[PDB]
Symmetry: C2
């Protein structure tokens, strides 16, 4: 049915966009993977900008649901940050989606449609908000020690994660991501 | 003359690639800026992969010459790292080239030509080598204090720089880059 074809197009486009960003895939590539013709893609999504806004909105919904599940299941804020690091290490291992869609698109902001840029920036502010709240709970519970504010530390940890994803993709390697991100976690442990 | 046209094409392509990466510009865009026709671009560069390898090799030559000049002019290793941070803050201010060509291309590695990937990875290993040597001199001179090895700290600082460039481009802002990168520098000051 129609819904399943729309889901297949979004699945496919998400995998392609993680390889090379907004301009690295075409509707022809989606036809090659999913088997629908070009005109059919347009019935589902009236433009590529709309397809990518829909993909990023779904990616954020899933990203927020996954860090919420960490927050729910894990009592200690430090262990929530450690489990978030572990989640990305598993994604880089599985190698299907070894990069954050929004971090990748952020590097291309100046050429992206404005509607896509809105979705990408919303993920950054939202992830920063989550990390800020986890760090604040860690202070409130005497589980962490910080220099500077929780928000400033959240912004450093998010930048370190995005830079570590980039180093793992570049000069190689399944231990890079942890080797870069974990020392902060051990620093801030009370 | 011929050389000047080749330089103009590389200048133009460097500015375009910093906006959106490898797939965000075409030879038509270069013709629009530089005024040569499509066939003329091909006389200078037999393929787009070759044009981009030439651009990245020139960008690295310049990047290495600039950090070498820091190293030459500045005696204290900590002040060499602080001046490197300042160099990127000035680039983000001037807004012409507010992102590293190689950091941007690294996010697209899976779709890049292999010859381009070689040049991008060479920049990462080389910048990591430079930062490692600056950190080692800082230890040898009693100017810095590190947890873990100099190379592991170099890899964190390079990832923090690349992640900070990304946050400055994303959820906005000429103070983000320093706000993320400078706390490390003050941490490691002896």
């Amino acid at each position: 049915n129609p819904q399943s074809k729309a889901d297949d197009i979004l699945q496919c486009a998400r995998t392609l966009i993680i390889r090379g960003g907004y301009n690295s895939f075409s509707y022809a590539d989606i036809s090659q993977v999913v088997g629908i013709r070009n005109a059919s893609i347009h019935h589902h999504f009236p433009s590529k900008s709309d397809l990518v806004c829909k993909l990023v909105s779904q990616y954020r919904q899933e990203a927020e649901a996954g860090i919420a599940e960490l927050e729910k299941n894990i009592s200690d804020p430090l262990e929530q940050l450690r489990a978030y690091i572990g989640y990305w290490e598993g994604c880089i291992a599985d190698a299907t989606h070894p990069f954050c869609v929004c971090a990748l698109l952020a590097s291309e902001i100046p050429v992206l449609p404005e509607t896509v840029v809105l979705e990408v920036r919303a993920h950054f502010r939202s992830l920063s908000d989550w990390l800020t709240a986890v760090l604040e709970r860690g202070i409130a519970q005497g589980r962490l020690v910080l220099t500077g504010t929780a928000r400033a530390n959240a912004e450093i940890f998010m930048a370190t994660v995005h830079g570590a994803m980039l180093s793992a993709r570049a000069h190689g390697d399944a231990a890079t991501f942890g080797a870069i991100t974990r020392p902060m976690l051990e620093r801030i442990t009370a």
